[PDB]
């Protein structure tokens, strides 16, 4: 049958109260299976269902290293959005990213996702074609031009079409 | 395995 995998990453800035809170949650079909929260004592990716215990410590280690990077991506890009939208560095703001893959009954890709939201509004999304982008406003248009010149679409497409699908089946087999 | 590091906004 059809299946899906989705990751949701959000970061909320804490004006003069420390660094942004970074959370990431994975979903297989529509159920949470993995989670990372920067606010933890020892922040690392954690199995949210018992069948994810099957993955060895290398898996968790490697996956945790990605989160650390993402956290850094979020702090910087939060500050650049303050720039585009001409806001003060004293207010709370939120940047969200969601990506993943839907597979068809034949196991192959049905739809890939890679999209971003700022303060609860759409920012930029990869279209279903996995070649073009939809920009919600003036500011996201800046990102669209940059991304069109730098081959961003082909970069995300590589992950969405291959690894994302392969790990989905990997998790399904564990389940 | 997760998506690689995203591009600059």
């Amino acid at each position, epitope marked *: 049958g059809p299946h899906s995998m989705r990751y949701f990453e959000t970061a909320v800035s804490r004006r003069g109260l420390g660094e942004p809170r970074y959370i990431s949650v994975g979903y297989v079909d529509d159920k949470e299976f993995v989670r990372f929260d920067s606010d933890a004592e020892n922040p690392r990716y954690e199995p949210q269902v018992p069948w994810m215990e099957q993955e060895g410590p290398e898996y968790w280690e490697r996956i945790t290293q990605v989160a650390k990077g993402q956290e850094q991506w979020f702090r910087v890009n939060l500050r650049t959005l303050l720039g585009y939208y001409n806001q003060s560095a004293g207010g709370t703001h939120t940047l969200q990213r969601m990506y993943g893959c839907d597979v068809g009954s034949d196991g192959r890709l049905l739809r890939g996702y890679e999209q971003f939201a700022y303060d609860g509004c759409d920012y930029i999304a990869l279209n279903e074609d996995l070649r073009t982008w939809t920009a919600a406003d003036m500011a996201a248009q800046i990102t669209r031009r940059k991304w069109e010149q730098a081959g*961003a679409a*082909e970069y995300y497409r590589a992950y969405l079409e291959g690894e994302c699908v392969e790990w989905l089946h990997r998790y399904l087999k564990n389940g | 395995q997760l998506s690689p590091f995203p591009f600059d906004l």
Partner: T-cell receptor
Amino acid sequence: EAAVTQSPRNKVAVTGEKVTLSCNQTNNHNNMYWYRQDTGHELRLIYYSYGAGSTEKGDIPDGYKASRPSQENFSLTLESATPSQTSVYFCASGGGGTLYFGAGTRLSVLS
Amino acid sequence: QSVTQPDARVTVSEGASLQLRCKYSYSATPYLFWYVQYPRQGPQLLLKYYSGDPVVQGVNGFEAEFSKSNSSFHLRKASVHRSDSAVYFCAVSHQGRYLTFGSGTKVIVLP
């Protein structure tokens, strides 16, 4: 691509000296990198930055320190220059995917 | 090692065809690049592969072919010139956070 510039281009340092290598990029790139190349062959990563305030230990960070005070400047400090730190040093920037290198900083150490 | 260049040096006659072999063991999604380093210079981007057409074109009449089945990103120039003499580096992205370079192939063009 020619928007990354390093300073100095050529140095002869003395052992124990504090040596600061400077990098400026006007590519509006968030990611900056310091590699070193000894053999005219492999480039090994020392330190990198995800943006202002970010500093990340590479594969061989020992004896080095880095500073990213702003988006355009990324400096590499040798606290106390040692002969083993003799190398060609390359700064790079990236906005995702590909990286763009500076022309290089030839560093010699005199004992 | 994430990328392997099996030949340290290669010699070809002017106007002949060049193949530079590259192999990767990177298990995740391979983002691949070829860089050219001219004497006393920083490495310059030739071409890259993210996805799509496995045959990609670079600057200076360079092309490379991605092959998943052979885990290779071999480089080609149909007709080499005197000035192609330089060192060539294969590179693979480390989870999108920076590049990991091969050992590099030195190309000698016999006039």
